[PDB]
Amino acid sequence: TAQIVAVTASGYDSEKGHVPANIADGDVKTRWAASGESWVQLELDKEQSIENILIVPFKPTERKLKFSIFYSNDGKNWQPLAEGLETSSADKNGEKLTFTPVTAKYIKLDTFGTDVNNWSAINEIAINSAAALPSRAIK
Ligand SMILES: [Ca+2]
Predict the structure, then answer these.
(1) N or C: which end of the chain has fewer CB within 10 A?
(2) What is the helix (H) or strand (E) element at residue 44, kind and residue range?
(3) Where are the domains of the chain?
């Protein structure tokens, strides 16, 4: 996987400490969570080729997360990989999202809550994962 060196976000659940770094700590038991329309931004160690994103949303069989994914080299000007996606509720395995490869230093997810409530909660994200999951092409 591509090294995530820094994570930032619009906000987070500070009472439970569901901080942005939890999205990239390699532990599916910790999560980032924020309410309302939110965003979480992943900075890689360098600009590099991106071919997949692994997303492990919280309570996936109960809650489908609505989100969009953007990429950038400067962290200021964004291009979409896909907009208005929902995560699957089929199982608890996460999903491997695929797309025409791009070059990026930053990946940003703009999130819109779930079909259950207005929290966005993600256990883990990884970039260029080898997870043994079927490819879900997103655009
Ligand atoms: Ca985590």
Answers:
(1) C
(2) strand 38-57
(3) 1-139
Other C-beta atoms lying within 10 Å of the C-beta of residue 95? 23
Q: What gap in Å lies between CA 104 and CA 12, rounded to an integer?
A: 25
Task: Identify the residue whose tokens are 């979480």.
Answer: 40
In the CATH scheme, what is the homologous superfamily, with its name and number, of domain 1-139? Answer: Galactose-binding domain-like (2.60.120.260)
CA–centroid distance, 46 to ligand 1, in Å, is: 22
Count of alpha carbons within 13 angstroms of residue 121, beta-carbon side: 20
Distance between Cα 5 and ligand 1 center (Å):
14
* Final resolution, Å: 1.4
CA distances from 20 to 91, 98, 132 (A): 24, 23, 25
Tell me how far the alpha carbon of residue 107 lies from the centroid of ligand 1, in angstroms. Answer: 17
Report how this structure was experimentally obtained.
X-ray
